[PDB]
Design a protein around this nucleic acid. Structure first.
Ligand SMILES: [Mg+2]
Ligand SMILES: [Mg+2]
Ligand SMILES: [Mg+2]
Ligand SMILES: [Mg+2]
Ligand SMILES: [Mg+2]
Ligand SMILES: [Mg+2]
Ligand SMILES: [Mg+2]
Ligand SMILES: [Mg+2]
Ligand SMILES: [Mg+2]
Ligand SMILES: [Mg+2]
Ligand SMILES: [Mg+2]
Ligand SMILES: [Mg+2]
Ligand SMILES: [Mg+2]
Ligand SMILES: [Mg+2]
Ligand SMILES: [Mg+2]
Ligand SMILES: [Mg+2]
Ligand SMILES: [Mg+2]
Ligand SMILES: [Mg+2]
Ligand SMILES: [Mg+2]
Ligand SMILES: [Mg+2]
Ligand SMILES: [Mg+2]
Ligand SMILES: [Mg+2]
Ligand SMILES: [Mg+2]
Ligand SMILES: [Mg+2]
Ligand SMILES: [Mg+2]
Ligand SMILES: [Mg+2]
Ligand SMILES: [Mg+2]
Ligand SMILES: [Mg+2]
Ligand SMILES: [Mg+2]
Ligand SMILES: [Mg+2]
Ligand SMILES: [Mg+2]
Ligand SMILES: [Mg+2]
Ligand SMILES: [Mg+2]
Ligand SMILES: [Mg+2]
Ligand SMILES: [Mg+2]
Ligand SMILES: [Mg+2]
Ligand SMILES: [Mg+2]
Ligand SMILES: [Mg+2]
Ligand SMILES: [Mg+2]
Ligand SMILES: [Mg+2]
Ligand SMILES: [Mg+2]
Ligand SMILES: [Mg+2]
Ligand SMILES: [Mg+2]
Ligand SMILES: [Mg+2]
Ligand SMILES: [Mg+2]
Ligand SMILES: [Mg+2]
Ligand SMILES: [Mg+2]
Ligand SMILES: [Mg+2]
Ligand SMILES: [Mg+2]
Ligand SMILES: [Mg+2]
Ligand SMILES: [Mg+2]
Ligand SMILES: [Mg+2]
Ligand SMILES: [Mg+2]
Ligand SMILES: [Mg+2]
Ligand SMILES: [Mg+2]
Ligand SMILES: [Mg+2]
Ligand SMILES: [Mg+2]
Ligand SMILES: [Mg+2]
Ligand SMILES: [Mg+2]
Ligand SMILES: [Mg+2]
Ligand SMILES: [Mg+2]
Ligand SMILES: [Mg+2]
Ligand SMILES: [Mg+2]
Lengths: 77, 103, 94, 62, 46, 27
RNA sequence: UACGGUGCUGAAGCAACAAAUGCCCUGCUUCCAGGAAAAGCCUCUAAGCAUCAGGUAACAUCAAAUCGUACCCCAAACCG
RNA sequence: CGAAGGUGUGCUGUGAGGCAUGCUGGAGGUAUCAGAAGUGCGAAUGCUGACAUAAGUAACGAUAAAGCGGGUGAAAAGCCCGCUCGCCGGAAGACCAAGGGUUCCUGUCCAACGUUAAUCGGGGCAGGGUGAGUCGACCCCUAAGGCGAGGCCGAAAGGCGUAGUCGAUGGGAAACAGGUUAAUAUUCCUGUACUUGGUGUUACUGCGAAGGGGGGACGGAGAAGGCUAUGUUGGCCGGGCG
RNA sequence: UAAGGUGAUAUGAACCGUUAUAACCGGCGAUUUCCGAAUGGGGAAACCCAGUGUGUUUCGACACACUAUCAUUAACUGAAUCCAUAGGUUAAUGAGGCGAACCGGGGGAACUGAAACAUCUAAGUACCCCGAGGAAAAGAAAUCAACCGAGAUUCCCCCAGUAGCGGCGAGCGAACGGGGAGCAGCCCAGAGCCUGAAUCAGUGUGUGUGUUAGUGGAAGCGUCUGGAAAGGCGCGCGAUACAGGGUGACAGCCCCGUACACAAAAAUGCACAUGCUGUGAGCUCGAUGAGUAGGGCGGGACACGUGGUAUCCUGUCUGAAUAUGGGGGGACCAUCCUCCAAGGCUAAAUACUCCUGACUGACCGAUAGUGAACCAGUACCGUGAGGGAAAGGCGAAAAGAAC
């Protein structure tokens, strides 16, 4: 499932509007990527299917804070 | 909480026997009684070899509505409506006239 | 050992018939209407206890119920079970 | 008869239940033939068995 | 001529039976409709 | 029987008719 | 003899020939298009067991449950 | 001391209509003045039910074929018994699977069903009838394929699929002859067998698997040879002498 | 509570009971086969096959319990790999499924209308899915206003078919403000001080009020017609009861009831009160929700279709200040006013009716009214999803026609 584990981003639905304003339903997918994050405390790598916004979030808050949030959310990693 | 019971002597208020008296033989669950000797019909009884009935025109008693009968008050010689009271913590019947307990 | 209460609920009735009279007088076999869940061992123990008689073998069959019409309304009778109980020779039963 | 049967033991109730069931068997075979001409005894027995099983579930496990 | 109904109870029950209905989501919605309508015979299954 | 009549109507029209019986296109 | 039946008794009961599309044959020969699986069965040991467990050999004994079995089935009983 | 409704008659109004009354019917009806409408039917190849018409017409479902006597019976072309005749006979005979689900047998009935009658019936009603260690299923095994712990994926539902687990149409132990019932029989009976599990003694002593190997285990066509089923003839026995 | 009962078609048989364990009604209990979430494994629903343990055994074997999956927690164990971790196993607690409408959310049509049609409309409708509750949702101003001021949310009447939006077409369509229903405010981002202080929750008890069986309950005779009186004609009586229904024709006074008066061993609801348990109250000084606001691109929502378009949401790329600061006031700037986002909770008024009880109807009266007044979601049809009927009335009483 195209879900960022960190931010909870999700494929949303919208429209392709043409020049003649013809509306067709499309989707807006998140830029998800699987990345191994070095956790220094547990001294191991943890793979997360995370968006690039979430990678900026981990670079700002730190990965320990985020894995605390995922445990408080009740999400496996 | 039934006013007219089994062994009671009643008089007939309405019908082809308006004024006759008799004893109740049994009361039915449909709100009807069979009074001894009153609502006589002649049933054409079919013979049965089993049960040893030759089969004939048997005259017997039909049921009648309780509303059509009333308890004969042998004191006054008339019909009286029936009320309920408690005597000794026990629900008894009494005549509405003269407030006398039905026995 | 089968419990006596079950052995008392196994047997329902004797089945009277021309075939039953023949099997009783020739092969010394009684014909019983039994409970539907009753097995052959339960039957053999019941006859050996409640009638005090020695059973050689038990043959069973299931009787399918007939489809009847009471008036014009359809209906179906119950399936019941029938046991041919072969007694040993010399044994006798009412 | 629940009042009478309450003043009994567990083994006495089991004895009565087993005598009831023997009577129920002998009635059922008697009515299987045309011998039984008191049909109400089957009902009386079926209730009395129910009273015994009831009191056994009261005295045991309750 | 060969007509379109050539019966087979095994194929009837594997295709339209109770457990085939209860297996999937949409089949369970069928039994809810037939119970709501008040069908006596809810399925094929005898 | 109007239920055997149901058969009658339900499928003496679902017999569907065969068709016109003159190979004529009035063309 | 209920004319339906039931009971008793009971001869000979061999050979030759022909002979299958059936059996030997899951064979044989041959061809190319190159022709299921798994268990039962047999056997081998592993940890384990060490004279116990288990194994086969004989004999004895017990058990083998439950369900179907009627009837039509190229058809008046199935699909029409 | 007879309502509505139904059916007639008489009278009356320009009309939609109104009034009275006879019969039926056997218990509700309602002036006036206002009010509200599911408010007026001949048509919609209108909807539902009933009855006509054609018409006592067509047809009565393979051109395999019937005839007679007797019986039963209210009644016999159709039922039963009998003698003839004809038809199938690689089926129009017999056994099953699938499927149906008591149509089986016996007694009784003939309203309806049966393209006629029906005493008959697969029809109505009642009763009876299906007996397995060896047949089959269940069961052990798997195929195609299905489901699918976890798992991977996916807006959600859900999709695929590992371990596994289901799944025969295929693999896997074992019974034959004779007799018998109105109806069951490789199921009952008689006779003679067989198989797999148990426990238990006695002798003997390497047992052990979720593992290894073997086996199971496999195509088409063709050619003969050896047989049997089975049949024919002879012999034999019993009967016959037209 | 009771003198009559053993449900109906539907008689009969055999019985029970009549002063109180007959029956009947209610409360609490007991039992509660098999399938089905179905949960020991499987499975063509109502079937097949087990395992472990504890008991019995007349050794043939019987009975009972347990054994699903997932989540969370705890214990033990435990790889590659040293620790470790993954994994494994036990145990405990919970969930799972069904169900009418209402509710919130994730997705999301077309016919149609535009007299064609593509923007638009239909319409965020139908439908599908997820989750919850008796209501939900929202909700305590980074709001409106306009230099006067108001003071959470929700609902109704106006404003107003206005302002606007719009192939400026068809059509869509507010708000400010006003009148009402109802009203309620709080907490954490943090330390102390006083300490148990408000309130809430649970659990007891007590009281009250209901509910789940029930009790009493007034008062009419004569005559006529007639099959039968409740009708007619006389003469009375009741009424806090002339609501209604039944009774052989239309009954205030025949019956059931009604008005009114009461009633609960037991269970339970709602209130209070109180006990216990938990919960913290208040004061001071602080702190004041960052990948956020905002921006670029693409879309969506706001009545507002990108237009000069504010505001809200965010798929993508970025990216502040932080109380001397920031947001809004419909492009935008300046001044002024007003408010304090990036954390939460919260009753009421509001919406609905599978179901229960009472009552009502210028609603129907058997081709109507529910499809169904009657054994109807039946018969029947269809492989299936699904479709889906017809069919009421003897009489007061069977006295249902002996012969
Ligand atoms: Mg569109
Ligand atoms: Mg045998
Ligand atoms: Mg059998
Ligand atoms: Mg047979
Ligand atoms: Mg044939
Ligand atoms: Mg008249
Ligand atoms: Mg009228
Ligand atoms: Mg008239
Ligand atoms: Mg008239
Ligand atoms: Mg009127
Ligand atoms: Mg009209
Ligand atoms: Mg007309
Ligand atoms: Mg016209
Ligand atoms: Mg017409
Ligand atoms: Mg004609
Ligand atoms: Mg003509
Ligand atoms: Mg002619
Ligand atoms: Mg002709
Ligand atoms: Mg013919
Ligand atoms: Mg003749
Ligand atoms: Mg003929
Ligand atoms: Mg003949
Ligand atoms: Mg010929
Ligand atoms: Mg039949
Ligand atoms: Mg026959
Ligand atoms: Mg017959
Ligand atoms: Mg005739
Ligand atoms: Mg005929
Ligand atoms: Mg028949
Ligand atoms: Mg097998
Ligand atoms: Mg497979
Ligand atoms: Mg799968
Ligand atoms: Mg999974
Ligand atoms: Mg298997
Ligand atoms: Mg097979
Ligand atoms: Mg036969
Ligand atoms: Mg192998
Ligand atoms: Mg081959
Ligand atoms: Mg030979
Ligand atoms: Mg001659
Ligand atoms: Mg009864
Ligand atoms: Mg299961
Ligand atoms: Mg299970
Ligand atoms: Mg299994
Ligand atoms: Mg359109
Ligand atoms: Mg248009
Ligand atoms: Mg809320
Ligand atoms: Mg101010
Ligand atoms: Mg009362
Ligand atoms: Mg009264
Ligand atoms: Mg009366
Ligand atoms: Mg009348
Ligand atoms: Mg803030
Ligand atoms: Mg932004
Ligand atoms: Mg902007
Ligand atoms: Mg944007
Ligand atoms: Mg941004
Ligand atoms: Mg902003
Ligand atoms: Mg401005
Ligand atoms: Mg806030
Ligand atoms: Mg109707
Ligand atoms: Mg009518
Ligand atoms: Mg069907």
């Amino acid at each position: 499932s195209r879900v960022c584990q960190v931010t909870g981003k999700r494929p949303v639905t919208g429209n392709n509007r043409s020049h003649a304003l013809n509306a067709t339903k499309r989707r807006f997918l998140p830029n998800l990527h699987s990345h191994r994050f070095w956790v220094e405390s547990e001294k191991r790598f943890v793979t997360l299917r995370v968006s690039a916004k979430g990678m900026r979030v981990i670079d700002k808050k730190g990965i320990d804070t985020v894995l605390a949030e995922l445990r408080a959310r009740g999400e496996k990693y | 909480a039934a006013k007219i019971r089994r062994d009671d002597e009643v008089i007939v208020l309405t019908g082809k026997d308006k004024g006759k008296r008799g004893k109740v033989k049994n009361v039915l669950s449909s709100g009807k009684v069979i009074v001894e000797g009153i609502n006589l019909v002649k049933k054409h009884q079919k013979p049965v070899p089993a049960l040893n009935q030759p089969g004939g025109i048997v005259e017997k008693e039909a049921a009648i509505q309780v509303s059509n009968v009333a308890i004969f008050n042998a004191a006054t010689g008339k019909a009286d409506r029936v009320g309920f009271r408690f005597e000794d913590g026990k629900k008894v019947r009494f005549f509405k006239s003269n407030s006398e307990t039905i026995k | 050992m089968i419990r006596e209460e079950r052995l008392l609920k196994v047997l329902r009735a004797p089945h009277v018939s021309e075939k039953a009279s023949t099997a009783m007088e020739k092969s010394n076999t009684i014909v019983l209407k039994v409970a539907k869940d009753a097995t052959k061992a339960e039957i053999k123990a019941a006859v050996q206890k409640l009638f005090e008689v020695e059973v050689e073998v038990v043959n069973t069959l299931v009787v399918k119920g007939k489809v009847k019409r009471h008036g014009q309304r359809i209906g179906r009778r119950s399936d019941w079970k029938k046991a041919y109980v072969t007694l040993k020779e010399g044994q006798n039963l009412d | 008869k629940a009042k009478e049967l309450r003043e009994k033991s567990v083994e006495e109730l089991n004895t009565e239940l087993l005598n009831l069931l023997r009577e129920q068997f002998n009635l059922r075979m008697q009515a299987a033939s045309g011998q039984l001409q008191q049909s109400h005894l089957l009902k009386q027995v079926r209730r009395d068995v129910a009273r015994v099983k009831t009191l056994l579930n009261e005295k045991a496990g309750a | 001529m060969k007509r379109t109904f050539q019966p087979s109870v095994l194929k009837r029950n594997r295709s339209h039976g109770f457990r085939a209905r209860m297996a999937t989501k949409n089949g369970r919605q069928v039994l809810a409709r037939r119970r709501a309508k008040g069908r006596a015979r809810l399925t094929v299954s005898k | 029987m109007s239920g055997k009549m149901t058969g009658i109507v339900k499928w003496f029209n679902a017999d569907k008719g065969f068709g016109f019986i003159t190979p004529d296109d009035g063309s």
